[PDB]
Amino acid sequence: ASADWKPGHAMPSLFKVQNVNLERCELANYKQSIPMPRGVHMNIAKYMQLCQYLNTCTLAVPANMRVIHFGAGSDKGIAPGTSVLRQWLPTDAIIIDNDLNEFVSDADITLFGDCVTVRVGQQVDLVISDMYDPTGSNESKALFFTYLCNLINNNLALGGSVAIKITEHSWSVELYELMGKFAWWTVFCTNANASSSEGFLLGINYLGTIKENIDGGAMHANYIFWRNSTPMNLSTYSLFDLSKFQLKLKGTPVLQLKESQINELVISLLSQGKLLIRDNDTLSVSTDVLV
Amino acid sequence: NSSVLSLVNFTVDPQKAYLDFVNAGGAPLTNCVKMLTPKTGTGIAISVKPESTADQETYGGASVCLYCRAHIEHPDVSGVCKYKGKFVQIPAQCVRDPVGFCLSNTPCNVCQYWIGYGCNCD
Numbered sequence A: 001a002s003a004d005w006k007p008g009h010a011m012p013s014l015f016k017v018q019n020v021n022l023e024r025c026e027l028a029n030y031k032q033s034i035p036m037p038r039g040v041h042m043n044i045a046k047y048m049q050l051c052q053y054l055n056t057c058t059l060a061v062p063a064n065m066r067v068i069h070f071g072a073g074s075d076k077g078i079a080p081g082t083s084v085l086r087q088w089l090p091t092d093a094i095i096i097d098n099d100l101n102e103f104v105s106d107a108d109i110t111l112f113g114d115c116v117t118v119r120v121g122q123q124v125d126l127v128i129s130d131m132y133d134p135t136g137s138n139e140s141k142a143l144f145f146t147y148l149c150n151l152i153n154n155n156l157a158l159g160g161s162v163a164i165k166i167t168e169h170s171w172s173v174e175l176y177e178l179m180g181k182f183a184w185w186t187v188f189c190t191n192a193n194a195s196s197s198e199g200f201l202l203g204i205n206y207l208g209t210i211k212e213n214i215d216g217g218a219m220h221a222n223y224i225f226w227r228n229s230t231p232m233n234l235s236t237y238s239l240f241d242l243s244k245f246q247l248k249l250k251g252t253p254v255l256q257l258k259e260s261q262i263n264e265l266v267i268s269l270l271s272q273g274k275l276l277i278r279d280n281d282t283l284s285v286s287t288d289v290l291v
Numbered sequence B: 001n002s003s004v005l006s007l008v009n010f011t012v013d014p015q016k017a018y019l020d021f022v023n024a025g026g027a028p029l030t031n032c033v034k035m036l037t038p039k040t041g042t043g044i045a046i047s048v049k050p051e052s053t054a055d056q057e058t059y060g061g062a063s064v065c066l067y068c069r070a071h072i073e074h075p076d077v078s079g080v081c082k083y084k085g086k087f088v089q090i091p092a093q094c095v096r097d098p099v100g101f102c103l104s105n106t107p108c109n110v111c112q113y114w115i116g117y118g119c120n121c122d
Ligand SMILES: Nc1ncnc2c1ncn2[C@@H]1O[C@H](C[C@@H](N)CC[C@H](N)C(=O)O)[C@@H](O)[C@H]1O
Pocket: A043, A070, A071, A072, A073, A074, A075, A078, A079, A080, A081, A082, A098, A099, A100, A101, A113, A114, A115, A116, A130, A131, A132, A133, A143, A144
């Protein structure tokens, strides 16, 4: 099984183009858990495998790279994912993380409270969300997805990317449809958490304009159809060799351009992971006082 | 964890309170963030990326800092933590209590290795 040695599985176009009803998700290895080496939290393997898959994507990686990590906390009050992001990202990357509840992390900036209180003063380069709310029909959810959808439309650099956790029941029509505004997208399921309906909705290289017309409710039905169709074995073999784990130091340029200047060359560079368009000031991220 | 963490809020000497506690048999603080790394690093104490050798484990810095973990003021004159946002290498034989180890040891200054656990300056 070569897929044992890959970090996970990505939803193929074979299933993106289907037209099916939304069914219940039925996973054969449900209630099974991958063992971890003593002292290693499972979310370490899960985040590492997500980073490993993103290593194969055309991520923009500038100097002073702007990364925000939502849902970074745990009931243990620690943030293993943020530490993986620190291990993965360039040393000069700026990591901001956030969670409803108190935690301690290795981020540069840590903000407690509802993600809606998180004020992004300037556009960012990568958004990671592990936000999940454990609280008959399976309809599109609002929750933190309204905030994330607006962030994509306003506070994400052209050329930027997102990786947003969804599950069978925690998902959003609008967020699937926003994936059509990236140069490429998929849902990525780690091998470490293969027995869960969890997936990471990836949008790679934001274009600010519709490249693919997506029916978000039908696409979540296709995602579940794919999960129901696809054996996935628990595994972390991809973590055995970590000699190339760190994100490539691409030196991706950051340009300021007006909308009228964005021609086919610029679209092409954004789409190849070779450019970001946004301000180059210093990033300001803070807690807003709401209501 | 809630036990020893609340315990160091009842003292003016959190370091001694933690060390005395684990020295008396108390359970070390758990849930330190242990990284997966190619055991091919330099072995220095604190580093921007993991640097464990074959005889070490690397941890997220904030998670092995008593002051970070208990949300109490750091003693450093600059007010900035020496571990937070960095990675800390722990000798393999001391992984049972990384928080106590960091409270009990010092990285060399003319050299970045743990004194007694890698620093060969004498
Ligand atoms: N609306 C929200 N705003 C900020 N955080 C949220 C929100 N909703 C859920 N969360 C967080 O979602 C997190 C889900 C956790 N499973 C995250 C685990 C964490 N990513 C890790 O590295 O282990 C919980 O800590 C929630 O508090």
